[PDB]
Structures are given as C-alpha cells and as structure tokens.
C-alpha cells in the first residue's frame, strides 16, 4: 500500500533486464 507494492514489480523486473543486455549483443550481428 502507498508505493508499497512498487517493490514487488522490482523483484520480477531484475530478470527482464538480463535479457535486454544480451539483446543489444544480437543487434550488432546485423
């Protein structure tokens, strides 16, 4: 409650950032 649940999305978002990094690595190919 009150910016309290905002942390919840920060937990499952750590894995979303791991894929974004490798993404830029696949772009240089083309």
Q: Which tokens is 20 given?
A: 């974004």
Q: What is the DSSP string of 1-30?
A: --SSTHHHHHHHTHHHHHHHHHHHHHHTT-
Per the structure, how many domains does the chain have? 1
> Among all chains, which residue has been given the structure tokens 């894995």?
15
Q: What are phi and psi of 2, to 5 degrees?
A: 55, 80
Q: Which domain holds residue 12?
A: 1-30
């Amino acid at each position: 409650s009150n910016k309290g649940a905002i942390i919840g999305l920060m937990v499952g978002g750590v894995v979303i950032a791991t894929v974004i990094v490798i993404t830029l690595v696949m772009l240089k190919k083309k």
